[PDB]
Amino acid sequence: KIIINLFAPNLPGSTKEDDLIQKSLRDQLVESIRNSIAYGRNVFFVDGTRGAGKTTFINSVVKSLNSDQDDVKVNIKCLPTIDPTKLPRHEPILVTVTARLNKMVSDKLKGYWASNDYRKQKEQWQNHLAQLQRGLHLLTDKEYKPEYFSDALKLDAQLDYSIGGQDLSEIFEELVKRACEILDCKAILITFDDIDTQFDAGWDVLESIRKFFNSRKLVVVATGDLRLYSQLIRGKQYENYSKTLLEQEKESVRLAERGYMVEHLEQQYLLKLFPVQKRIQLKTMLQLVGEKGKAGKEEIKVKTEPGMQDIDAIDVRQAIGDAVREGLNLREGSDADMYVNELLKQPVRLLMQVLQDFYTKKYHATSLSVPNLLRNALYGSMLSSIYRAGLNYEQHRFGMDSLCKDIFTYVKQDRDFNTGFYLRPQSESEALRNCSIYLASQVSENCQGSLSKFLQMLLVGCGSVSIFNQFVTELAEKFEQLISEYVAYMSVGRIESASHWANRCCAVVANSPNDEKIGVFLGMVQLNRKSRQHMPGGYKKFNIDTENGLAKAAMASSLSTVASNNLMDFCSVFNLIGAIADISACRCERSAITNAFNKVIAQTTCIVPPWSEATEFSDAITKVEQWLKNVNEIEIGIRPSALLIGKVWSRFYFNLNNVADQHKTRLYRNAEHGRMASQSNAAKIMRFNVLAFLHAVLVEESLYHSVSDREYIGEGLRLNPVTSVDEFEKKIKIIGEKLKADNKTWKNTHPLFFLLISCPILHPFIFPVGGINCSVKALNKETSFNKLIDEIVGDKLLSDEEWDYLTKNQQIFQNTITSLNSSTIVGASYDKDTPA
Amino acid sequence: LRNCSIYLASQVSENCQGSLSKFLQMLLVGCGSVSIFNQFVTELAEKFEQLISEYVAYMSVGRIESASHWANRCCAVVANSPNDEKIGVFLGMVQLNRKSRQHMPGGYKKFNIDTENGLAKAAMASSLSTVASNNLMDFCSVFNLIGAIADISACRCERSAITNAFNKVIAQTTCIVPPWSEATEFSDAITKVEQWLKNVNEIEIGIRPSALLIGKVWSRFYFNLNNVADQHKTRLYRNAEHGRMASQSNAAKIMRFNVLAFLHAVLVEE
To answer: Are A428 and A624 in contact (CB under 8 A)?
Structure first.
């Protein structure tokens, strides 16, 4: 039961009483110290996580063993802690200990209890103190002088040095005994700090402990890195080898037995100095509180508000959990606890400062943008990791442009493009998995309350990683040159517009010459720009003028041109998503929408990446105007996350892999009007590519969205709607009934899917003329599928006349694509027929 | 190395103690990754340090999100090794066609997942893996099955975890070839699993596995899969669909002994 008040009048830099978390370990070590004395070298090694309060921990032990003086039978004074790195480069540790031990004795003597014993103790103390000074040359002699033998032959029976000679090990141990007699104790507890930042100075510490600090009345508590001591000890055993021997025996066989001996002297030197049973390991607060399920050794409570009673404080795991789920915008599931578990392995002071920097600023504001509060809390307490990993630390450029560059440079260092855009604390490097929580907060705070930013992170943020992994990385330092070219070409660092990124995506996925050159790529087809001859049936060239308003605009927004050996023309879902993101971030004014609307219609041509070998629309403008009225009032309740955006893309990115594979072998001669499952055309491919986007934003957004507590997909086996809309219709039907039964609304539970399904620009792509499987059994799902979409939006997207043409084998159509199916695809050979 | 061997044996006997999921992950990711490199990647090799780094980075050794995800990478590396006789009957896995092929004798057809029902559909989907080669390839594997068991048994009694464990890899995983490559029914299925997890949560507490047991189970299991992948690739005949005699083999029979190999190896060594 530990109560830690984040609203204490001081920062976590105060190590006050009842303010040390490692109290159980400290008393376990202190008791272990007393047991050894009560019974001749007692060396305790204190090790912990890098950057932990080991210096603070030993400084609590020195205070704990000095606070008690009459309650305990065993009395232990404690020299002030020694820092071997802040000492003169030539002062021996024996001098440093004696210098501090002398002041402890002198201060005790200056108490003036009585003059009867003051003189005797001073007389005897100054005898040993001055005798040690006589023998100090042996520590710092460069050669033996024949006159020191006279000193070694002087005998002082008043001093009682039994072994004989001038032995510094025994002179000091009698000096220590006088100190204990004067101070009325049983131990001295010499304490050392880390030998970091100068680990040459550690050899004096090791040599002094081995020779002078084994006296049954001295306790040593060292701390630091046992790796650093091992490199120190191993280096000295090589110094015991004669230089001539190493120059003459350099072969592998002679060097192996030389190294296999030093690894055996080093092994026993640590065991001699720091015994295994004496080594002390600081418990990280994850081990103090245990796992999520099982209880820990000791329970920790943190006060999240000022004035909370000790019975009102909540657990540290839930204190972090309330900050991770609300900060990273994660549901109360396994992935939210994945960040909490990693955060619990952080240094004790570092994490408790994160909680204070979060809750104190949260309480003051509440008296909101919680992800911004968590990002600020993570920024101050963790800024070293961001600097170490090369991320963007300048807190004035935090935006879409900076984050997407930080995501790509994190995945590059994480060396995992397959799943590096989830921002999960999996990386081995401490700095890298430190930035995972930081970037996750950055993703959740930029994209909060904005549909346009959600689609920008989906494409520029996560998509740029996936595009590189499948289409660019196989061509490859030479790898870093490709990385620099890819980020510069795709402009991940600077996002001019979402559709601008999409246009460069068409040219890079088409870089790889597809086998059989069918002309269908990842989420796109290569519509033919030059009318080729002898096309069976009604396979005419694609003409944008055929489509009317809201259909030509939908086509043009999805059409991109690539300047290659031929002026390649591409229709892709990516250009369609980029159009949605650009339009969604527009002012409600009529004219501002019109300016932004026409940008996607520019039919902009984009150059091949360098690593390669080389009013008519007035109806459409009104509908996209009314749609943005919903977006500007519904998007405020959107709470996306790195996991959500990553999961939505991952299914969507893999969905287009199936569609580009299943449909690449179904472009048959009689597929002018695709009505069977095995018949596919350009309209059908670009319908399921759009339907794939609308599916991943449905199932993966129902699973992972902070606004809704529980899922609505049901206990089903979720697959993707490829070659058939049966599976996409099923989930909408299943979710709708539960929402109706639970008295829930689509906009209040699926804000991301509701806006995109109600967005008019991609509405024609849902039901193209040639993309509807017009069978008997399958079309029954489609009729319900049309009604379910109409029920969600509330407006009948396709009326009876429009729908009756589609199902049953001219009227002017504007809310649907009318000429995509008849278009021919580059390289789509038409010399085969549908099987009978 | 003789000093780390006993220390590592204490690591394996500590993490895997009192758990069934951790035993399978140690068997599949720990022992499994060693054999996969030893027989399917080691032939391409300093060049070894970059091949070792390539293998570890690709398979995310030390970064496993789930054993099922490791199984997907296992399928790619096992498949992409140059195989004689050019049949997709690899070690512990069979490669099923994804595109319809004409002129197929008998009742043979491309594998469709929709025709299954209930628990069979869930288990069949859990054994399905995909790799993004020049063209998509679909595999049915026992390694995918074992990965599912480790993931399902690691969750709690809640139903939502069980259905998410089933829907963990199938439709949201894009496995790319390694850099060294040359190229309601379902409601009752959850009830059966959730009832099984109740047995697991009270039986696995007394499980005390060792690094020798886990190592021995894999060695017999890995050796068994070599025979099932060799004594069956020459038994794919026209009339072998039913497989009622010992001389006929097919996709269902191969995966019958691939799973039976796993269950036998566990029975013998344990």
So the answer is: no
Q: Structure solved using which method?
A: cryo-EM
| Burial track A15-25 (b if 16+ CB lie within 10 A, e otherwise) | eeeeebbbeeb
The gap from C-alpha A713 to its chain's centroid, in whole angstroms, comes to 29
H-assigned helices in A663-799 = 682-703, 726-741, 746-749, 751-757, 763-766, 777-793
Picking from A718, A720, A835, the nearest residue to B102 by CB comes out as A835
| Best CA proximity match to B32, nearest among B223, B218, B234 | B218
Q: What token pair was written down for A534?
A: 């002898």
Q: With CB atoms and an 8 Å threshold, state whether B176 touches A418.
A: yes
| Amino acid at residue number A69 | Q
- Which is nearest to A72 in space by CA: A186, A220, A176, A215? A186
Q: State the resolution, in angstroms.
A: 3.3
Residues written for chain A: 836
Please state whether beta strands A42-47 and A219-223 pair in parallel, antiparallel, or not at all (unpaired).
parallel
Q: B76 in helix, strand or coil?
A: helix
Residues of A in Cβ contact (< 8 Å) with B136:
657-658, 661
Report how far residue B18's alpha carbon sits from residue A601's, in angstroms, rounded to the nearest whole number.
Answer: 63
H or E element that contains B94: strand B93-96
Whole-number Å distance between alpha carbons of A690 and A671: 20
Rounded to whole angstroms, how far apart are CA atoms A369 and A377?
A: 13
How far apart, in whole angstroms, are the C-alpha atoms of residue A442 and residue A403? Answer: 7
Place of tokens 């033919």: A528
| Helix, coil or strand: residue A520 | strand
In degrees rounded to 5, what are phi and psi of residue A310? -60, -25
Q: Which residue do the tokens 């989907």 mark?
A: B125
Q: What residues contact residue A67 under an 8 Å CB cut-off, 6+ apart? A: none
CA distance B173 to chain A (A): 7
Token pair, residue A517, equals 């050159």
Q: What residue has token string 């021919």?
A: A824
In order of A165, A469, B120, B135, the CA distances from B139 in angstroms are 82, 22, 16, 13
Please check whether residue A447 is in contact with residue A645, taking contact to mean a CB–CB distance below 8 angstroms: yes
